Nucleic acid binder design. Structure first.
Ligand code: ZN
Lengths: 95, 64, 103, 97, 78, 80, 105, 91
DNA sequence: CCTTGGCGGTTAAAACGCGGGGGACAGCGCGTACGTGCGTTTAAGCGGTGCTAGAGCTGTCTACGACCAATTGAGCGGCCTCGGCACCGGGATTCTGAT
DNA sequence: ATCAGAATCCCGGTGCCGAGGCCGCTCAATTGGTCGTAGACAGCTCTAGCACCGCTTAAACGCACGTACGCGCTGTCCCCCGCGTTTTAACCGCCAAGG
């Protein structure tokens, strides 16, 4: 039996965080998995173009930041950059 | 009316025997081989005289 | 897990693996997947937060995809993002040109 | 007795903006799609989920193109659609040369 | 053939589009544009399955062909 | 300042004529200016962001090429 | 023939393309026939469009191809126009589109 | 930083051998060639990752050229590519 | 007596039909916004000229990343429960038109 | 306006079914340890981006003025809405005679 992938449990937990009293359909969970897929793919493609228009092959978080604020529209993007940056601080401040 | 027939032929790919199904559509002269195991499919023209051994023969020559 | 060590919810190393097998670069840094995972996390938080409000509207408990399409089509920046996006069981805006309303 | 026209149509617009269920039902759509693919290749057993995908994408596609065509006609100082309206909308999007 | 598309089907398409009043030649024009749409879609879908060396077009290939025409659709594992 | 009003009516005329437009209404020009402005807003935002990660205070032609390829309004001619 | 270009009888450098594939982060490994195949496709595309370029430039008694020639030759094609639909050429312009409602009748 | 200029000159002399060209025409041509190369190559990389094939042979390139260019161009290109494969494979 | 064709029965969306009514289309007449010229004013363009951030380009050392054995428990495949919606009749209400 | 009456909304009701809990696995994240060069950084050099101005001139601006498409209106005529009437796509239960 080949082991297949999903992101269902993760975003499921996130949904339980932001709304404890809320159910969901299974197809919509698949939709959100496809959503994460699509956003990830556009970001990664912008990362590869970041590489080739920078002639470098290392990926750091700075490239991810500039990729996100290339793709996403402004206000949403800046809030997301804030979330990611504070997470970078909280992780890399410890181990 | 279409004819859905099971055969005792061996699939040329997955090698499972007695798992090839033949669907012969004489109204449009189109025969269809199907594998009940690995799921492959092969189409070939048939006449009015053809039988599951006629298209399974054409499938052996289509591979080689 | 690094996600817990980042205090977040998305698995880092799965993403670190997928960055490798995507031919995305030659080498992969340390905390870039953490940043990307947090980006994903806030995105899905915002989207499903509006979806939760959409379920609050209809007084439904389980999310139907119609809620998702509506919450996409209401907010501005999200709809400009997902302009080329459609969803099965989507539907559209309940919208009537009032010039075609009778008099 | 007889109702006055235009009303029932808009009432069922308000009804049909609600359920996102598929408008074209399955079997004839499936036959049309099968009769089309055959022109490209033979012996191609379609996954039924793929058939539902084709059905969804086709119906949403046509609904949106209708929306733009309808707004074209509203701009055209009229209420009824015309085929030239579809030609105008397609000429803006760029399917045909 | 193509005439399996009923008149009230395209009418329902106007209704979910929200369109009120309908002309005549609309029907055949609709069937034509739908045909060309499905032609390009299923052509490159069968191209995907040709590379797949397999006799059944995957739903995945349908999804990826929609991506190839810039018509990205979620929902069915894409 | 006010270079948005540097857009001249005869330039809009010339663009209409190569655009093939015959008859010109008077309520068109500032609407045209606003659409042109929003266009160039999104363009130069993305180009400057590409140059932000470039760590060079000067934007190149290549940058604008890459940014407009990102919008899908992709233009040839200058390499990129 | 020492060079693979002479071994293919073509005009493009293949090992160029193979290094481009290697310095592409495209696949992990690249076979031997794919770069030759793609370069041949490129060479066909060049010759095919330059045919329409040659006729379109010859339309105006000018030995040199200008960008306006290229845009004309594209828009006068059907497959190339649906190819280049999202595409714009520098110094291009568009076709003569004089509507019939405009000529003095 | 190489452009494809004399390649264009040799194609041109193989087709319309009495024809000049401007500089920026060559620039637009090389822009074109790079765009086409990038689109095909990325589509082939999509073929790999959508098909879990760890490398790319010529068959992937054939089906990708099918996926990009429409009919007549596609068939003539497949013909030219297979002919090149044939003559390179013979020697 | 046990099979492959060869005809037979729900029901429900689907095709006619009329009539007409309200909406599409030609004309009518004006009229007031707008082409066109002409003279008048203006700013843009071009050619030099200083001219300097600053990109463009080159050694270098490191640390972070590539990569390799244990380990291990989280993530995953299977099972099992219940209350969340899907529809159904009640009943009430609100459009809609003839009045 | 205004009543009658279609059309729709909306409230228990029950049922059934899949969402979600749950639980025992095992394989990739981890943990730790070992080379290594890519890049962060220091610094050199010359280009080019910038600013400025003088001279030239063609290009814009304002107005004079007719004028003619844009538009409001009109009559009209016709042909889709819709409601009614069959009616056939779609989908389950019997006679053939040949085996
Ligand atoms: Zn098989």
């Amino acid at each position: 039996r080949s082991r297949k992938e999903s992101y269902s449990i993760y975003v499921y937990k996130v949904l339980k965080q932001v709304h404890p009293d809320t159910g969901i359909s299974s197809k919509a969970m698949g939709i959100m998995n496809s959503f994460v897929n699509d956003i990830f793919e556009r970001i990664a493609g912008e990362a590869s173009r970041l590489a080739h228009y920078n002639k470098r092959s290392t990926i750091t978080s700075r490239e991810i930041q500039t990729a996100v604020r290339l793709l996403l529209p402004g206000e949403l993007a800046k809030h997301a950059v804030s979330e990611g940056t504070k997470a970078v601080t909280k992780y890399t401040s410890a181990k | 009316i279409k004819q859905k027939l099971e055969t005792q032929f061996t699939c040329l790919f997955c090698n499972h025997d007695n798992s090839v199904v033949c669907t012969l559509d004489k109204k449009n002269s189109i025969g269809l081989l199907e594998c009940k195991k690995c799921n492959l499919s092969f189409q070939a023209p048939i006449n009015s005289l053809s039988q599951p051994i006629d298209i399974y023969s054409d499938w052996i020559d289509a591979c080689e | 897990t690094r996600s817990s060590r980042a205090g977040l919810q998305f698995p880092v190393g799965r993403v670190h693996r997928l960055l490798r097998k995507g031919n995305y670069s030659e080498r992969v840094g340390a905390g870039a997947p953490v940043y990307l995972a947090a980006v994903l996390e806030y995105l899905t938080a915002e989207i499903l937060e509006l979806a939760g409000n959409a379920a609050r509207d209809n007084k439904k408990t389980r999310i139907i995809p119609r809620h998702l399409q509506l919450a996409i089509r209401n907010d501005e920046e999200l709809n400009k993002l997902l302009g080329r996006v459609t969803i099965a069981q989507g539907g559209v805006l309940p919208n009537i040109q009032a010039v075609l309303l009778p008099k | 007795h007889r109702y006055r026209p235009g009303t029932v149509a808009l009432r069922e617009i308000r009804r049909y903006q609600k359920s996102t269920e598929l408008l074209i039902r399955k079997l004839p759509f499936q036959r049309l799609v099968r009769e089309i693919a055959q022109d490209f290749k033979t012996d191609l057993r379609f996954q039924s989920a793929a058939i539902g995908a084709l059905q969804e994408a086709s119906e949403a596609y046509l609904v949106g193109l209708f929306e733009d065509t309808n707004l074209c006609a509203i701009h055209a100082k009229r209420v009824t659609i015309m085929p030239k309206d579809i030609q105008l909308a397609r000429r803006i999007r760029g399917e045909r040369a | 053939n193509i005439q399996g598309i009923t008149k009230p089907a395209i009418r329902r398409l106007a209704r979910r589009g929200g369109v009120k009043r309908i002309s005549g030649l609309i029907y055949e024009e609709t069937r034509g544009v739908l045909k060309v749409f499905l032609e390009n879609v299923i052509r490159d879908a069968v191209t995907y399955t040709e590379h797949a060396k397999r006799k059944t077009v995957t739903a995945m290939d349908v999804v990826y062909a929609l991506k190839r025409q810039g018509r990205t659709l979620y929902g069915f594992g894409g």
